[PDB]
Each structure stands twice: as C-alpha cells, then as structure tokens.
Amino acid sequence: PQETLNGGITDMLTELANFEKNVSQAIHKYNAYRKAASVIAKYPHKIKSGAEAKKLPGVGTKIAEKIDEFLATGKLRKLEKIRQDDTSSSINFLTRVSGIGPSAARKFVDEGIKTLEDLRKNEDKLNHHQRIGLKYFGDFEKRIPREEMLQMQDIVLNEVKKVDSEYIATVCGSFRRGAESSGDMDVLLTHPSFTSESQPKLLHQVVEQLQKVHFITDTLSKGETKFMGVCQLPSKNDEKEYPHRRIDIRLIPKDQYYCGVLYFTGSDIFNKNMRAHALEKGFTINEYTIRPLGVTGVAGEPLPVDSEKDIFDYIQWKYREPKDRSE
DNA sequence: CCGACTGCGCATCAGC
DNA sequence: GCTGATGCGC
DNA sequence: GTCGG
Ligand SMILES: Nc1ncnc2c1ncn2[C@@H]1C[C@H](O)[C@@H](COP(=O)(O)OP(=O)(O)C(F)(F)P(=O)(O)O)O1
Ligand SMILES: [Mg+2]
Ligand code: NA
Ligand code: NA
Ligand code: NA
Numbered sequence: 001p002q003e004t005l006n007g008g009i010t011d012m013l014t015e016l017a018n019f020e021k022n023v024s025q026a027i028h029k030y031n032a033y034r035k036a037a038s039v040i041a042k043y044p045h046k047i048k049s050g051a052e053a054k055k056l057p058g059v060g061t062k063i064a065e066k067i068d069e070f071l072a073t074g075k076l077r078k079l080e081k082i083r084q085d086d087t088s089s090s091i092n093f094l095t096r097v098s099g100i101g102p103s104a105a106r107k108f109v110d111e112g113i114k115t116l117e118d119l120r121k122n123e124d125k126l127n128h129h130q131r132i133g134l135k136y137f138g139d140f141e142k143r144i145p146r147e148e149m150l151q152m153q154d155i156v157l158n159e160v161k162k163v164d165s166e167y168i169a170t171v172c173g174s175f176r177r178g179a180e181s182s183g184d185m186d187v188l189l190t191h192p193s194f195t196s197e198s199q200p201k202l203l204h205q206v207v208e209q210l211q212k213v214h215f216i217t218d219t220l221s222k223g224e225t226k227f228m229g230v231c232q233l234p235s236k237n238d239e240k241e242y243p244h245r246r247i248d249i250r251l252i253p254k255d256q257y258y259c260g261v262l263y264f265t266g267s268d269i270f271n272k273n274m275r276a277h278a279l280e281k282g283f284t285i286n287e288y289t290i291r292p293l294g295v296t297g298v299a300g301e302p303l304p305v306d307s308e309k310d311i312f313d314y315i316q317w318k319y320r321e322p323k324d325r326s327e
Numbered sequence: 328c329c330g331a332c333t334g335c336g337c338a339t340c341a342g343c
Numbered sequence: 344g345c346t347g348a349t350g351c352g353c
Numbered sequence: 354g355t356c357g358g
Binding site for chain 3: 083098099100101102103104127184186220226228248250264266268
C-alpha cells in the first residue's frame with residue numbers, strides 16, 4: 001500500500017480497465033481489471049513476476065502474463081497499440097464528457113466527431129446532459145478543496161432548513177470520509193414524512209430554493225427522490241469566479257437513513273467489496289436495507305436498524321470508520 | 328464448459 | 344398516448 | 354478477466 005511499489009502495474013491495469021469499459025463496452029472485464037489493480041495496490045511487496053501476482057485473489061493467467069511482459073519490457077504492446085489508435089483513443093477521450101458514455105462516444109466517433117471542438121460544432125447531436133458536461137468539461141475534472149466543500153455545505157444546510165426545519169441534510173461521499181478534497185458534493189436528505197407514507201414534492205422544493213439563491217445553476221436529472229446537477233459558490237469583490245461543481249441530492253426514507261449514509265459515503269470500490277463478500281456471508285446490501293438469502297436467493301422483511309448500524313456485525317467485519325473507506 | 332460478477336434512479340430510446 | 348429496455352453515472 | 358459450480 002505504498003504506491004510506487006507497483007504503480008506501473010496498477011497504472012497498466014487501470015488503463016486496461018478503462019479501455020474495456022469505454023471502447024470494448026465490456027463492463028465485467030473493466031471490473032476485473034479494477035479488482036486486480038486494487039488488490040495489487042494493497043500488496044505489501046514489489047512484484048517480481050506474474051506468478052507472484054497470480055497468488056492474489058483477482059489476479060489470473062492473463063493478467064499474470066501481462067505483468068511478465070510489463071516487467072520484462074516496461075511496456076505493453078496491446079496498450080501501446082491502443083493508445084496510438086485514433087478511433088479507440090478518441091472514443092476513450094470523449095467519455096470524459098459527463099453524459100457521453102461508451103455508446104455515445106462510439107456513435108460520435110463513427111460519424112467523425114472526435115474532439116471537444118467537434119462536439120461544440122455539433123451541439124444539435126448532443127442531449128441536455130451532454131451539452132452541460134461539455135460546457136463545464138474542465139470544471140468537472142477539477143477537485144473541490146475541503147474549504148470550499150464547507151462553504152457549499154453551509155449554503156445547502158442553510159437553505160434546506162429555510163424550506164422546512166424538519167429536513168435532515170448530510171453531506172456524504174469523500175467529504176464525510178474526511179478527504180481534503182472532493183470530486184463533487186453528495187447530499188443525503190431525509191424528511192419525517194418520508195418512510196412508507198408519501199407529499200412527493202419534498203425534493204422539488206429543496207431544489208427550487210437552491211436555484212432561487214443562485215447556488216444550483218443547471219439540472220442534469222431530477223426525479224422524486226434524486227437530483228443531479230450543477231452548483232456554484234458565490235464570489236466576492238472582483239474575485240475570480242469559483243468553478244462550477246457537480247452536486248447530487250438523494251432523498252431516502254427516514255426509515256432507512258443508515259443504509260443511505262453507508263452507501264453514499266461510501267466509497268464506490270468499498271461498497272463493491274463490502275457488498276461482494278456480503279454475498280459470501282449470506283446477505284445483500286443496498287442503499288435501503290440489508291437482507292439475508294435464506295433459500296438460495298431470498299428477500300427478507302427488513303426490520304429497522306435500531307441502533308448505529310452494525311450492518312458490519314451482520315456480515316461479520318470490524319467497523320472501518322469513513323476515514324478507512326477508500327478500499 | 329459456462330454463468331456470476333455490487334447495486335440502482337432518471338433520461339432516453341424502442342416499440343405497441 | 345402508453346409500457347419496457349437501455350445508457351449513464353452514481 | 355477471474356473465480357467457482
Ligand atoms: N457503482 C457504485 N456502487 C456503489 N456505490 C457507488 C457506485 N458508484 C458511486 N457510488 C457512490 C459511493 C460514493 O461514495 C457515493 C458518491 O459517488 P462519488 O461522488 O462518484 O464518489 P466519492 O464522493 O466517494 C469520490 F471520492 F469519488 P469524490 O470525492 O471524487 O466525489 O455513491
Ligand atoms: Mg462525490
Ligand atoms: Na489468483
Ligand atoms: Na462520460
Ligand atoms: Na456523485
């Protein structure tokens with residue numbers, strides 16, 4: 001877990017993972033490559049051979065021999081050739097625009113659209129989300145200093161309580177994990193009249209207020225229980241404007257807060273793993289509930305969290321505080 | 328050999 | 344008009 | 354791609 005220990009290898013595997021997701025559209029190879037990259041990143045030795053790497057869970061014959069080629073040459077012919085391929089590297093680049101996934105990137109590249117400038121020249125072919133991701137392309141790849149996160153949280157908390165005192169608003173994600181920077185802002189939201197009962201307008205009013213005071217600036221998606229959009233800190237004197245930022249709001253049944261906060265905290269690789277073996281344990285976890293598997297695939301009446309969680313005791317693992325949840 | 332693989336709300340697309 | 348499937352990014 | 358039925 002020392003980073004320069006096997007960074008070349010895990011770099012290589014992460015680049016392979018991205019090519020599989022964005023170009024081959026092979027999501028399970030993508031996950032396989034990332035699981036291998038992850039397990040190797042936590043391995044406390046410098047790998048000397050593919051055979052050594054193959055001992056780790058999630059490393060197999062194919063990654064083993066990619067490793068031997070990489071150790072033997074410091075390169076991978078397949079990646080070498082892929083990077084040089086105009087179609088493939090354009091498809092992969094385009095997926096960095098929010099809203100453009102592997103399918104859209106492919107469709108765009110097939111009709112001659114390969115760069116940010118081609119997209120701008122072709123805004124008719126873009127949907128609402130895609131135009132916004134293009135508009136804020138740079139900003140959306142910028143990190144948010146924790147200091148700004150705190151200002152953002154002040155505004156969110158302040159404006160939420162205005163709408164209705166009984167709302168609860170939690171800022172989750174890496175911020176809740178104490179990170180000194182974040183890629184976006186995730187707001188977990190609950191209201192006492194949302195558990196089992198419902199009025200289905202609680203989220204709309206939160207959103208509307210945040211737009212009113214010019215905090216939220218764009219909408220990407222907006223439904224009953226989930227908002228995805230764009231927001232922005234106000235600026236000062238002649239102050240340089242802050243970057244536009246991605247913000248999501250999830251409205252959970254108050255019934256199910258703890259499962260909500262575990263999941264939106266998370267981290268994404270951490271939920272994959274926490275859920276992946278929870279399957280081993282005879283359980284399945286989502287943002288709503290933890291449930292057992294009784295027969296050979298069961299639901300199970302999910303009765304209510306009583307205390308903190310010990311979701312973790314149910315699947316028999318020690319509590320990793322949000323700080324230790326990057327993995 | 329061959330299927331599972333973490334889990335899901337909303338926008339859009341496919342179709343009746 | 345509608346239902347159901349898929350893409351997308353969580 | 355990897356793991357396991
Ligand atoms: N496929 C998934 N499965 C489970 N949880 C997920 C998944 N994808 C995303 N989540 C997440 C778990 C995740 O914690 C939460 C928010 O997603 P985020 O904002 O993309 O991830 P973080 O905020 O942690 C970040 F570190 F990447 P940031 O600081 O750069 O924004 O839903
Ligand atoms: Mg985030
Ligand atoms: Na292995
Ligand atoms: Na994208
Ligand atoms: Na997010």
